[PDB]
Amino acid sequence: QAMAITQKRPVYLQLVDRIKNEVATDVLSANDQLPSVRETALQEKINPNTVAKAYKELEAQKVIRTIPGKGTFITGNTASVKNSNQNRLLADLSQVIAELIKSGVKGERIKKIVNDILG
Amino acid sequence: QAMAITQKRPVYLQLVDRIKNEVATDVLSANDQLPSVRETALQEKINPNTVAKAYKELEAQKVIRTIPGKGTFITGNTASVKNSNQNRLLADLSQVIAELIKSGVKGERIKKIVNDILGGK
């Protein structure tokens, strides 16, 4: 019954998040060359092992791919990355609204508020 | 220009957060007596010192009051706390909608989505 403590998000997952969001927001486009593990480690001040762990994760999620001799590239399957991103965001939307109606805010007023926020 | 790295939220502030939400949601009510630092440390399995930092901060935010020789108590001003908690969630709400619009989702769609999410029993 003791409270759950949230830990640091691992640094390698923070970098996955960053690259993924950059793809979703078109800072990084489909088939763009991504820097090397070295260049990323050097630019972000992150241990190369952590960057390599990031890049492995990103590849598993199909956000990036490697071409032998040519380096690491943003996937061509970039619409799929954007949709998964929106889903992360929609999950968050769902959760804030739930916590709002739980805080005593009625739905009809959440509708009004949202309409104001969007106007 | 290195990316910002987000650290662990200090445990004392996670406990500050936990208690304000209980207040916000009427789990703890106005003027309810709070356990001692030692009893909270045993409930939440935290260092007593950490719980002491949490209590000290909850008090700075006027969420709880330590009245000498008697105890530590939830504020009488809980409607204030409920209102700021809502504001926090409302800030989170425009943040997520902002970010959905920037991930290319049209606002008219977000509007429909919110209705769908809200249509649930």
Ligand SMILES: [Ca+2]
């Ligand atoms: Ca290199």
